[PDB]
Amino acid sequence: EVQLVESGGGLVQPGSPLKLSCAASGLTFSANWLNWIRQAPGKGLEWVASISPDGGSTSYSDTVKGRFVVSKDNAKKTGYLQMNNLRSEDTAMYYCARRATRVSPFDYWGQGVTVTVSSASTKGPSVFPLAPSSKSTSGGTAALGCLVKDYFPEPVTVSWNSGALTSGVHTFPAVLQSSGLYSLSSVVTVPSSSLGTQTYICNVNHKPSNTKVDKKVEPKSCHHHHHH
Amino acid sequence: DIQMTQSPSLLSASVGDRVTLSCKASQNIYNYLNWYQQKLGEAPKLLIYYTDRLQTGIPSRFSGDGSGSDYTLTISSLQPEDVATYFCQQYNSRDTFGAGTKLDLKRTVAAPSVFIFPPSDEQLKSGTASVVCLLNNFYPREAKVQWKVDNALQSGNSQESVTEQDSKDSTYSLSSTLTLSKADYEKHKVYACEVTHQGLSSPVTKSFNRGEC
Ligand SMILES: [Cl-]
Structure with a gap:
């Protein structure tokens, strides 16, 4: 079955270049049109560029023409998007997508990677445990999580137990702190009976600062009839 | 075009x-x-x-x-x-x-489950205290969280955000964090978040005492 996987992205100074890649399996870009489409708040989805199956033909939107270059490596079954002289207007999540012909739909899409064009410095997240306790227990369910504080720019990616835990996970939209930095929380509800035997680890990825954090979240003893 | x-x-x-x-x-x-x-x-x-x-x-x-x-x-x-x-x-x-x-x-209306999290030792060591209140799986989306410190209503030190609507049960969840410098944090005893929602007959309060865990 078909899969498109993109790589690259992060924070870049205006004027600087960045290159994205799109690796295909289950299909070859020798028989398909590779397209690039970008998404940003207030700008919905916006077609950026394409390269023909025979690779003889490239097309670009007015806004990126002359700065962006699409290419392929049929040996690698991989496509690329070289971005040059980036402007903040270029900030977006960039998707690769395939269509069999120019009148076919985009039936397969990459997962999206983010390109942020800014003069501001990147800042990696601090990751703090939100520990389960009597105070985060309700009936037979306990809540736990991670607080991801003081990062820039967006986004941060969070998984639990390397992706093996998805049920009952809630990763919230980031908030903007008065410092210009961002913060978000990710939480899970699990059986309270599971806290003594199960390990819970939040995997936090922030591409712009090249950081990957795994934080083990462990139970705390918060039950007191009398506070000393 | x-x-x-x-x-x-x-x-x-x-x-x-x-x-x-x-x-x-x-x-x-x-x-x-x-x-x-x-x-x-x-x-x-x-x-x-x-x-x-x-x-x-x-x-x-x-x-x-x-x-x-x-x-x-x-x-x-x-x-x-x-x-x-x-x-x-x-x-x-x-x-x-x-x-x-x-x-x-x-x-249909679904009442939030309410959870509170004391600040981390790691974070306190850095000079800041974040307290987090979770409202899990409720409907409708409108839900009021109020932070009370020693039973005094707070303002200006909290931020919240709500999830997209859930794919299976059509509810929402809500996270709220109160943030104080460690110095301001150590000035008070009881930290509470108080929740009002269509699904709750009267406000639900979850709280802890600073330093208790
Ligand atoms: Cl004291």
Whole structure:
């Protein structure tokens, strides 16, 4: 079955270049049109560029023409998007997508990677445990999580137990702190009976600062009839 | 260019209803229109292509229709997992997409489960105290969280955010964090978050004493 996987992205100074890649399996870009489409708040989805199956033909939107270059490596079954002289207007999540012909739909899409064009410095997240306790227990369910504080720019990616835990996970939209930095929380509800035997680890990825954090979240003893 | 206009921007319904989304092009596109569905954190997913052709693997309850400049997508019996944003895309001229229509559902009232988290030792060591209040799986979306320190109502030191609507139960969750410098934190004893919601007969309070864990 078909899969498109993109790589690259992060924070870049205006004027600087960045290159994205799109690796295909289950299909070859020798028989398909590779397209690039970008998404940003207030700008919905916006077609950026394409390269023909025979690779003889490239097309670009007015806004990126002359700065962006699409290419392929049929040996690698991989496509690329070289971005040059980036402007903040270029900030977006960039998707690769395939269509069999120019009148076919985009039936397969990459997962999206983010390109942020800014003069501001990147800042990696601090990751703090939100520990389960009597105070985060309700009936037979306990809540736990991670607080991801003081990062820039967006986004941060969070998984639990390397992706093996998805049920009952809630990763919230980031908030903007008065410092210009961002913060978000990710939480899970699990059986309270599971806290003594199960390990819970939040995997936090922030591409712009090249950081990957795994934080083990462990139970705390918060039950007191009398506070000393 | 040919510009696509989608209506309405926000569409509200309930499980089992018939929903019709609108897409109008600035000029004739001769049936060259595709429909995609996108959920938060995911790539767009093809639903309908060439006006009315159902993509393989997509539920029969999705259907497309239209001609000239005016198109529609119809979902015949809304399901909880249909909550998402829907985009149309023309490919007559150079590709353009509509700005999208977001679909949300009304369901029965569901009361939040409320949880509180004391600051981390790690964070306190850095000079800051964040207290987090979680409201899990409730409906409707409107929910008021109030921070009280030694039973005095706080303002200006908290931020909250709410999840997208859940794909299976159509509820929402809400996270609120109160943040104080460690010096301000060590000035008070009891930290409480107090929750009001349609599903709660009277306010629910979860609290802890600083330093207790
Ligand atoms: Cl004290």
